[PDB]
Amino acid sequence: TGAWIVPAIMACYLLVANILLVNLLIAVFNNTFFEV
Amino acid sequence: QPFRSDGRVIYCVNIIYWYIRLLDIFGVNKYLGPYVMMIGKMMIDMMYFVIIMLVVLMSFGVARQAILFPNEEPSWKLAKNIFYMPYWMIYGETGAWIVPAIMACYLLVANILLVNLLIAVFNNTFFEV
């Protein structure tokens, strides 16, 4: 009936877990290259 | 036989070079030539990266092989384990907490440091050529 709160959790997990934070990390480690 | 299998293996390792040899021709293409020279610079860059990658990675691998499987007899299969098992350790898993610190540092320094260092290195080498 209302078993749809869980796929929203997996959907936000896929949205913010790798696809945000990992690309933030290559961006951070790319900016620190030329400064040193 | 069994020298026919050795000749087949030598043919099978020669076809690799006879495919790699096409990069010298590709070196003349206005769009492939920069990529061939980029492979040429990235070979030296990855060669210098490989020492730090080994120092980071096979030390843990030795740590995993000395924490787990504590009864491995002296044989040459130990070296094959310590540079084959951590190569495929993606799917692998009172005071029994020293091991999760090892996995935690492994996840911290193995991919999430060295791989991003590698896209950073290969991104800096783009505009210079």
Added chain:
Amino acid sequence: LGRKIYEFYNAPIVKFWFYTLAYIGYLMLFNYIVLVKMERWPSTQEWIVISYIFTLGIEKMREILMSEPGKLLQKVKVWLQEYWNVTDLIAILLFSVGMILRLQDQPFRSDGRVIYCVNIIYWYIRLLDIFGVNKYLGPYVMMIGKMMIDMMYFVII
């Protein structure tokens, strides 16, 4: 000929290459004593690693004694201002604790083996300080140094 030998072996580059060949041998013997069996009494390959750690401890004591300031606490603080000296001392007391636990019977031998297995990690990481001098590896070592602080601030988020 003796003057030539003494002039060769007192050179700093010769000392550096001799010292890193002795490390490479130390890493080899430490890998051997963490992969092969370990009994009530240590083998030759483990007594060599024990003697390695004890002679470095004596060398670090000579670094404590033979330095520039005259006060003992002042020269101790000056030597401990460098982070690598701190982690080297931490590894020396860690190895002596692991050896003392290993010299006892079971289950303390497993604890000594675990302490050896966590000390080999630092004794591989210590090579980054040497790599810091390579014209091509030194930038990468400093990049690891900045990326440690960057990943530490990233880890909270």
